[PDB]
Amino acid sequence: ITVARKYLQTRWGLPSGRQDGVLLVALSNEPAARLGSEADAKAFLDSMAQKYASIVGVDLLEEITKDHKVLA
Amino acid sequence: LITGAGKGSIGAEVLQGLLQGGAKVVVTTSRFSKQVTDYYQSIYAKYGAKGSTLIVVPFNQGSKQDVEALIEFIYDTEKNGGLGWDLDAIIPFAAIPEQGIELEHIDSKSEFAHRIMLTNILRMMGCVKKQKSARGIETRPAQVI
Amino acid sequence: TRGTNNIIAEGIEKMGVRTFSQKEMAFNLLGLLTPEVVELCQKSPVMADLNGGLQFVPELKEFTAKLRKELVETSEVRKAVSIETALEHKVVNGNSADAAYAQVEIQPRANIQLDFPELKPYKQVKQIAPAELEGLLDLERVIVVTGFAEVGPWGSARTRWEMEAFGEFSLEGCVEMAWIMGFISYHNGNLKGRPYTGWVDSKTKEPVDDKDVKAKYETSILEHSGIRLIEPELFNGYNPEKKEMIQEVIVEEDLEPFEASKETAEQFKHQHGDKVDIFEIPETGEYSVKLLKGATLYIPKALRFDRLVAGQIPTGWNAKTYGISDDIISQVDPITLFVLVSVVEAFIASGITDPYEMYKYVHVSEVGNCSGSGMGGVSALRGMFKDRFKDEPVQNDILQESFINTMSAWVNMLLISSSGPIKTPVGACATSVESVDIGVETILSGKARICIVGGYDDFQEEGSFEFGNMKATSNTLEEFEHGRTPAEMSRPATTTRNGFMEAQGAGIQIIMQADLALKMGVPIYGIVAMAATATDKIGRSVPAPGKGILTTAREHHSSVKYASPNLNMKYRKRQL
Amino acid sequence: FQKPWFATVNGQARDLATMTYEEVAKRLVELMFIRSTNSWFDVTWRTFTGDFLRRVEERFTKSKTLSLIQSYSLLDKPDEAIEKVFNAYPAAREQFLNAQDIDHFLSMCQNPMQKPVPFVPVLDRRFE
Amino acid sequence: LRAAQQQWGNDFYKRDPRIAPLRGALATYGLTIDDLGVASFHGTSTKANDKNESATINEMMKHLGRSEGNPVIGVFQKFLTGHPKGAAGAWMMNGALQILNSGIIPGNRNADNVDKILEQFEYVLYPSKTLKTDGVRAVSITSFGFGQKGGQAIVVHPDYLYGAITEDRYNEYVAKVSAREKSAYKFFHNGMIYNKLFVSKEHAPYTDELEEDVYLDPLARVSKDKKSGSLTFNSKNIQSKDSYINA
Amino acid sequence: GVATSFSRKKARTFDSSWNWAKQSLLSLYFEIIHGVLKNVDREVVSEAINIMNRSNDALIKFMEYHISNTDETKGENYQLVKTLGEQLIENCKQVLDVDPVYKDVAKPTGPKTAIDKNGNITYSEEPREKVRKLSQYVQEMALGGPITKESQMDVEDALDKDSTKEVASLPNKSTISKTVSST
């Protein structure tokens, strides 16, 4: 739920209470199976934030170091 | 022992005869199915005389290994999982239809067909000879039609 | 030899040569096995000409070939000349004068029938039973079967009886099977422009004629009903070849931490204590869960099982198509759906179209339900014992549906509305007969005048496995080893019988007072003239069959010199 | 009214799914074949009842054979024609109209290229 | 009168030890032991069951005096449908009714070879093919279950019932049944085509405020409503003088 | 094509003539009653042969019960079953303690081709004009035809006229002096 908000905010620009709406819309549309790809889970969060978009009425490298620090 | 006695054949007419006379017969089938199992139960429940018994086994007269395996299962004591029999007749009518094959067409099929229709028939007679002989059976020839 | 190129047989024979039927050659060959020619063989090899003189006909190849050519030519000229004189007619004499001269073929459609029983002229009726019988019987105490239905591997009572008694379906067979199995769906409206009224392939939505249903579907219909390989789609994925189980292991070195909710992390710490660390991630509010060395883990693994075949309801059966609401479908255990559908189909078989018509003839308190189950609700049982154990989402009243008497409850709550008796039998593999006993008795005591009788059980993963453990069911791996197709693995009284084949479904019948049946004017399919249950003796093997039921033949022969007037109807009738 | 309720059999009110194949064929002839002029008042109405009798054959036959109404001209003696059909398929006198044939019948009533049928076959939305 | 009918017609053998249950069951309709034509075996296809069941059926025939040479013809429908534990007896009870009313005895089509053991049971006949007979008089459904749960049922042909009733009454009956069949053929093809076969009842025949009044009047019965046309209990038929008069 | 097919476990053995015989007979029986087999059909003779081929002290008590319990009165078909039945019961009594025999009674046939008036080639198998018994077939064989040049008895059958009568004949060993070889 941590990663799913940092995606909703990075790629779809959603603050604290606006990503609360996108999670609540995804709760009514919950998959009847676990999503396979992380890209399938990203694509799911996409369409869920646009069903929130027209229900609220709103429209729409450090990562290299991150891989190394993990190692250390 | 009778090979080639599938439905609608000279085989199956000879088989009905044998059963009607009270013979104990092993029939080979190549296409061993429910459909075929059901055929023979029908045939037996019609012509199966007192003292008769029909045994259907799947078989491929083209396999050396099947020829050997079959007539071994025939001679082997019931205890050892066999039939415990000793053949009095062999009717090796098993075959494959070769048509439209002339001299220069003789190939994989015909060479295989020749095996079923000659070489393995020899092998089969040879097999029951060894069995009888290995048992001192000198006064019970099997007739080969 | 002619048998299943004989066209020239008559011709070759026209030369004093004989051709033979197979029965003839077989007779000839068999004649070489006669003692006489057998001993001949033993003296020195015998050679038998069983070739009816063909030897003598010269240039046989070419002669043969000629006959064939002359035939084939005579055929092809004769057919070519006729096809041309026939076109010359359509030219000279118009194709509209010949068009009103062809006849119209009529093609059959399926008229499925309820197949009620036949009532003979009373003259013939009174010839069956003794004339003394008239009015001898209190018809208020003759238990009679008024309707029946089933849901099972072979469809309904109609299609199953057809397969059992005949071995192939009629037109009404396929059309009904295709319908229950979902292959065809009814349509009435416009089909791409023109109007249509009839069957439609439900996948393609194209029209289908009754006379075609067989060619189009039966091949597949047959493949997907009866005793066949277990289709995991029909059982939430139960796959006898890869059977899911978990094993316990102790973690030998600290697992790597994973993120989790606060509520969830606490449920872990509650469980593991010294053997797990959970810590709040101050930024998100959520916790990290780290399983230390010493902790207990469940690691999934798979098991290959022996029972690969069951008698399953035809693939595509759907309580939705019998007309059952989605809400019920959800709420209920599969077995209740079987039961519901048959109670409906059984009332139909009895010509009771609205259950409340009973309440025209009877009081609310005199319609009962004595249907029973061996296990019943095996599916809700799992959700309760296993699906809960995994914290999987499962209903809050799966307990309801697990009970055996709740099937009868939904029947009464959705359909019947009776305040009659409700005695529910558990009789393992005989709950159904015991049910009839219980039914019969309840009517003979005045407690009910109509009641529902029958049995039902479902096939599920844990059921089949435990039977396999009792060594009760047939071993499919072994059946295959013996050359046995699935349709062949249930063979009672056979030399090779090897264990029983498991199945699923339900079957109920409606029973009634003979007197009431006559008055209502429903069909009468038979008389339940006796029904008994009996225990065996002292033992220690529960799954064992016995001879308790032999007691239904118990009569005392210590004195049988002279005839008992009691047996004599003529006598009894006078006394009455 | 000039359009009777079709599924009324000898004064007896009833519905279309509670008539037998005979009752319908006889009701058809009754309302479309004008007795006094020994004539089908409209050729489409003769065509109609033919299509219906043909259907009767289709339903009740067991195997495939050929129609007893090869040409609808045979309907010009309606009574005789009807008896021919139902003699062959006697069962059709005793059974109510198959549920699926009701849809059919009502569909023919909606066929353009046919003089509007002289009755009301159904109480429903298009009753006006 | 009903009790006299009972004493001499229905239950004459109850208190008799020389008349077995099975005997008298058939005997009340003028049927002999030999009349039980078909035995619907449980036929579990297990070695344990099939032998036992044959033996036990054999003995109940032997004890009661089944004519030497008249075996019961056994069906084994588990061969086609399998074994659904609980639903077993019912399926066999159906096939039994269908056998009675058709005269057809289906064949154990999976009987490649009858177990030689079973030859001793000279009162049982194991057919591998269907026999279309000129009549079946009575079938015997027997079934066995875990926990020594044994059970038998005897189903007698319907036409023996009509013997015990007046001709005028029988004729009146045939009338009603005929009308039902027509109206049921109606219903069935409706619900098949339109998936209307099951139609959940959304109300009881009694209003909630009438529920108790119905449970307590034994003569309360349903009548077609005017408005709805469906079957309800009326205030005027509950505890009525008219329903004591007409009863 | 040379792959293996035989395994011992796939063998199926058929034993129970004792049971198929009661069935064989209880079938001929309903079939005559229902008139599928009429007293002309050769099938009743064939099937007689197969029933006799399985005489038990037990098969007898079977036919005995079922035959003696038929109501001759019930119909013309019922008398037939009963008469044939009794005849069959008699024969079985004799063939008890007697070797089973292969005897083909089928009606002998020959080839017949016919081409339509519209070029439709059709093949039938017709009964041979001058051949009716397998007996007559052997005689036909021994005479040969004119085409075999250089070298290198009338026993009227009740055959397709009265099956029950022929059935009564079955148990009786034919004595012949005029050996067919001498024809």
UniProtKB/Swiss-Prot annotation, chain A:
4'-phosphopantetheine is transferred from CoA to a specific serine of the Acyl carrier domain by the C-terminal PPT domain. This modification is essential for activity because fatty acids are bound in thioester linkage to the sulfhydryl of the prosthetic group. It comes from the Eukaryota. [Alpha(6)beta(6)] hexamers of two multifunctional subunits (alpha and beta). Present with 17000 molecules/cell in log phase SD medium. Fatty acid synthetase catalyzes the formation of long-chain fatty acids from acetyl-CoA, malonyl-CoA and NADPH. The alpha subunit contains domains for: acyl carrier protein, 3-oxoacyl-[acyl-carrier-protein] reductase, and 3-oxoacyl-[acyl-carrier-protein] synthase. This subunit coordinates the binding of the six beta subunits to the enzyme complex. Belongs to the thiolase-like superfamily. Fungal fatty acid synthetase subunit alpha family. This is Fatty acid synthase subunit alpha. The lineage of its organism: Eukaryota, Fungi, Dikarya, Ascomycota, Saccharomycotina. The chain holds residues 243 to 339 of 1887 of the full protein.
From Swiss-Prot, chain B:
[Alpha(6)beta(6)] hexamers of two multifunctional subunits (alpha and beta). Present with 17000 molecules/cell in log phase SD medium. It comes from the Eukaryota. The chain holds residues 679 to 823 of 1887 of the full protein. Belongs to the thiolase-like superfamily. Fungal fatty acid synthetase subunit alpha family. Fatty acid synthetase catalyzes the formation of long-chain fatty acids from acetyl-CoA, malonyl-CoA and NADPH. The alpha subunit contains domains for: acyl carrier protein, 3-oxoacyl-[acyl-carrier-protein] reductase, and 3-oxoacyl-[acyl-carrier-protein] synthase. This subunit coordinates the binding of the six beta subunits to the enzyme complex. 4'-phosphopantetheine is transferred from CoA to a specific serine of the Acyl carrier domain by the C-terminal PPT domain. This modification is essential for activity because fatty acids are bound in thioester linkage to the sulfhydryl of the prosthetic group. The gene is FAS2. Residues 1-145 are annotated as: Beta-ketoacyl reductase. This is Fatty acid synthase subunit alpha.
From Swiss-Prot, chain D:
It comes from the Eukaryota. Disulfide bonds: none annotated. Fatty acid synthetase catalyzes the formation of long-chain fatty acids from acetyl-CoA, malonyl-CoA and NADPH. The beta subunit contains domains for: [acyl-carrier-protein] acetyltransferase and malonyltransferase, S-acyl fatty acid synthase thioesterase, enoyl-[acyl-carrier-protein] reductase, and 3-hydroxypalmitoyl-[acyl-carrier-protein] dehydratase. Present with 91800 molecules/cell in log phase SD medium. [Alpha(6)beta(6)] hexamers of two multifunctional subunits (alpha and beta). Belongs to the fungal fatty acid synthetase subunit beta family. This is Fatty acid synthase subunit beta. It comes from Saccharomyces cerevisiae (strain ATCC 204508 / S288c) (Baker's yeast). The lineage of its organism: Eukaryota, Fungi, Dikarya, Ascomycota, Saccharomycotina. The gene is FAS1. The chain holds residues 899 to 1026 of 2051 of the full protein.
